[PDB]
Design a binder for this molecule. Structure first.
Ligand SMILES: Nc1ncnc2c1ncn2[C@@H]1O[C@H](COP(=O)(O)OP(=O)(O)O)[C@@H](O)[C@H]1O
Ligand SMILES: Nc1ncnc2c1ncn2[C@@H]1O[C@H](COP(=O)(O)OP(=O)(O)O)[C@@H](O)[C@H]1O
Ligand SMILES: Nc1ccn([C@@H]2CO[C@H](CO)O2)c(=O)n1
Ligand SMILES: Nc1ccn([C@@H]2CO[C@H](CO)O2)c(=O)n1
Lengths: 227, 242
């Protein structure tokens, strides 16, 4: 009975920021953050996020499986014990198992960072992992935060995560086109048929946060009352 | 889950599939879940429903061969897929076999416990998997077991014991192409792990019930005819203890 909303967008578009803001409007609303802290210290452990950026042809498959697993684990745990003694419970996911596969992993495959065997294994693993464990995780709606790759590049410097500081603009441009093809043009098809009827709210977040944040929060409230 | 689950464990080419495929013929309540070795040497993911009508299921990579050729690069990848494909196969047969059995028994060729505590652990110990890879693998494997709880728990284990030299010869007899370069030293390491887990029972697992699961050790070093009778008898006796 919890409504599951995924918040999607490029790296450093502003998703944790916006969603941590939005959480405070209702006691009924909670967030599942993207487990980037677990990725940076594998458990002090290895930094598999950094391994993937420095040696993507070596570490990409390993990173992607750990990434998707940590996300499902965290999403299932928030569903199972949180809210539910609540009038209208909403859970916001920072991204989903669908961006894991169809944006990020897919882009590593198209870049030759994963070979054909690695990609076939990843998809088999993802198909099976989701058909079992991830049934309770189907999305009721998606919020797309769009910001240009230049904005996202600026916001990477501003935030200052060490593993990310060498990300080139052209890398962010590739991830942007994939989001646009998925969530704006809707030309990117998944092997999950329910996803084609999931409503999408696109929000422009290119501006500084004083500029639009009232309209944005309100649009989210409008959007959620519909579901 | 009135179905009794019995795993068959032992080294490569010990004779596990030969024994159990013959053994299961004694009852209609006995079935076997093979190890998905063919899926590992020919890697394939599911086709789209419209694409498969016009496109053949192509032969994919051989991650079994890749692991044997460069274990340091491919071990983690191989072991993750080795365990996934096994769990998928084991759970499906649990859900759909032996619905009209009186005393149903499902034999598993190996288990998720040997995937981790024998094979993957030996790869880590050989430094074919690094600390980050071993941590990820174990975390994954742990989380998956929690999720089923008692779904795949074993009522018993049958250990088929064969010397490294026997297995090495049997690898040659069988003729599986990717196994032909396996040195005796590798088989001997796997041999010591089974003995610790299954015979001396000193190997510690995160799964507490295993410390007390009934185990039957059978020597399969002899030619097949020479001992099959005594074996089948030990097995039937064992099964009635459970
Ligand atoms: N609208 C905005 N205007 C200026 N900075 C923003 C805005 N939204 C987010 N930021 C900043 O950009 C960085 C990335 O935001 P964050 O929420 O961490 O991105 P994400 O969660 O999408 O990776 C942080 O420094 C954050 O303070
Ligand atoms: N007891 C035995 N005596 C002679 N050959 C055997 C015996 N058990 C198995 N074999 C042969 O040894 C090879 C390996 O057996 P197999 O059951 O495929 O091993 P596993 O399933 O443990 O890898 C096959 O060629 C099989 O015919
Ligand atoms: N499956 C994923 C998910 C996210 N990423 C990148 C890598 O880290 C950032 C965190 O926002 O995003 C990724 O590379 N792969
Ligand atoms: N998890 C596993 C399971 C089995 N093996 C080896 C590799 O494949 C042969 C098949 O018996 O055995 C392995 O290397 N790792």
């Amino acid at each position: 009975r919890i409504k599951k909303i995924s918040i999607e967008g490029n790296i450093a578009a502003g998703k944790s920021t916006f969603v941590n803001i939005l959480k405070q409007l209702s006691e009924d609303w909670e967030v599942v953050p993207e487990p980037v802290a677990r990725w940076s210290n594998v458990q002090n452990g290895g930094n598999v996020l950094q391994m993937m950026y420095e040696k993507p042809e070596r570490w990409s498959f390993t990173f992607q499986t750990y990434a998707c697993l940590s996300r499902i684990r965290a999403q299932l745990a928030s569903l199972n014990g949180k809210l539910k003694d609540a009038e209208k419970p909403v859970l916001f996911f920072e991204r989903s198992v669908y961006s894991d596969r169809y944006i990020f992993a897919s882009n590593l495959y198209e870049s030759e960072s994963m070979n054909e065997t690695e990609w076939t294994i990843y998809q088999d693993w993802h198909d099976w992992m989701n058909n079992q464990f991830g049934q309770s995780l189907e999305l009721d709606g998606i919020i797309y935060l769009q910001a240009t790759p230049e904005t996202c590049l600026h916001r990477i410097y501003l935030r200052g995560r060490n593993e990310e500081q060498g990300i080139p603009l052209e890398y962010l441009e590739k991830l942007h086109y994939k989001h646009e093809s998925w969530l704006l043009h809707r030309t990117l098809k998944t092997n999950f048929d329910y996803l084609q009827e999931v409503p999408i709210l696109t929000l422009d977040v290119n501006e500084d946060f004083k500029d639009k944040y009232e309209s944005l929060v309100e649009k989210v409230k409008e959007f959620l009352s519909t579901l």
